[PDB]
Design a protein around this ligand. Structure first.
Ligand SMILES: COC(=O)[C@@H](C)NP(=O)(O)OC[C@H]1O[C@@H](n2cnc3c(N)ncnc32)[C@H](O)[C@@H]1O
Ligand SMILES: [Cl-]
Lengths: 112, 115
């Protein structure tokens, strides 16, 4: 089923967009957990990483490359953390695959 | 040397021990020595890349493969309630081994924020 991230891709509700191409969208998280906290999502509706297909490998890697490029553009020269959450135990909040990128502060261990 | 001389390069070449879950021509999945969850493993490329910030555009398929292998290993390990994947960059990310590594953590409720 559709999610709020689908609405964001479709431009039906606003988001602070950082980057877009034909296959993904990066935008600041509405509930940021670090001074910089953004998401990179595919335009293809993959509901969760556990159901991603082998043919999705380059698209998933594209999310990470876009994420690291956006992190550099946003000035995260001291580092950052990338996160993908799966399911209940993973704390996944939206059933549309989304890569979190967090920085601008020390990230701690364990990662939740 | 193929894989570099970080401890992960040593693990790739079987020069120091590891508890391996899965291995192919592109990557290796093995359990973390300091687990932060009941199940906590790493997926690393066999190609040495020091950190995600220096990955090349042509590394997209390899990076995605780490995630596909991670999710397949999580299923094979029975993490049916979910899990969290983590890649750390540099000092603020907490990176400690400069060879790209994807963490997969599960078997308990993970909390927010993720550190
Ligand atoms: C502060 O460092 C960290 O915990 C994370 C955040 N940094 P990191 O660079 O993201 O993760 C490196 C991980 O590599 C694991 N490790 C280190 N030596 C071995 C080994 N010989 N076999 C298996 N796992 C090993 C550590 O316990 C870390 O969790
Ligand atoms: Cl999420």
């Amino acid at each position: 089923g559709d999610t709020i991230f689908g609405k964001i891709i479709r431009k039906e509700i606003p988001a602070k967009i950082i980057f877009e191409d034909d296959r993904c969208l990066a935008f600041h998280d509405i509930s940021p957990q670090a001074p910089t906290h953004f998401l990179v999502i595919p335009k293809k509706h993959i509901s969760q990483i556990s159901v991603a297909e082998d043919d999705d490998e380059s698209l998933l890697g594209h999310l990470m490359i876009v994420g690291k490029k956006c992190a550099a553009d946003l000035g995260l020269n001291k580092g950052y953390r990338m996160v993908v959450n799966e399911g209940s135990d993973g704390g996944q909040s939206v059933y549309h695959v989304n890569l979190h990128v967090l920085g601008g502060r020390q990230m701690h261990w364990p990662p939740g």
